Amino acid sequence: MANITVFYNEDFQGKQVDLPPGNYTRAQLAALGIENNTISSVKVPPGVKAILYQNDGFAGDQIEVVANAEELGPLNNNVSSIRVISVPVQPRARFFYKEQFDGKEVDLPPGQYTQAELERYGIDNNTISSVKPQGLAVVLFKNDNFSGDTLPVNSDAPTLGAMNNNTSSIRIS
């Protein structure tokens, strides 16, 4: 019942398409219609972990995700091959764009992120705000390699766009 959902245009914009898990490429896609510069944004719920592949035929710099990716990454200039495999259930956290549990919503599973993936994997170098732990507590860092001042969000906070200065790294515990 799971299935990844891509977006034609960037910024989580542009008609989306639901593709079933499993491994496939330009061949299967040829059957559909989309291919190449199209898988701009992505949205993949838990229960499964996806792996993207720039060049078709499963080649080129690959990627790995299990949540949504408003801004995939630099290699987003070309996409066609992918690989998805079911995965155990894992809680996560939910962040909102505007300060008011609103605006572009993004979420990430438990783990660690830096000033590169995090931003280009859920939001960006900043503009976070209101957070809502969907299952695990969230901790923010104000420096690369998660090393410096921090703000451990041990609970609900539908408003935080006034403290986290430049979120360089995070740790969903």
Annotated binding site for Ca(2+): 8, 37-38, 40, 54, 77-78, 80
Binding mask 106-145 for Ca ion (x = CB under 5 A): -----------------------xx---------------
Residue nearest to Ca ion (CB): 159
14 contributes a contact to Ca ion by CB under 5 A: no
Q: Can you tell me the distance from the alpha carbon of 73 to that of 124, in angstroms, rounded to the nearest whole number?
A: 11
What SS3 state is found at 115? coil
160 contributes a contact to Ca ion by CB under 5 A: yes
Residue span binding Ca ion (CB under 5 A) among the ranges 31-39, 81-89, 138-146, 160-168 = 160-168
Beta bridge partners of 83: 23, 51
Binding site, annotated residues:
8, 37-38, 40, 54, 77-78, 80
- Binding residues vs Ca ion (CB under 5 A): 10-11, 99, 129-130, 159-161
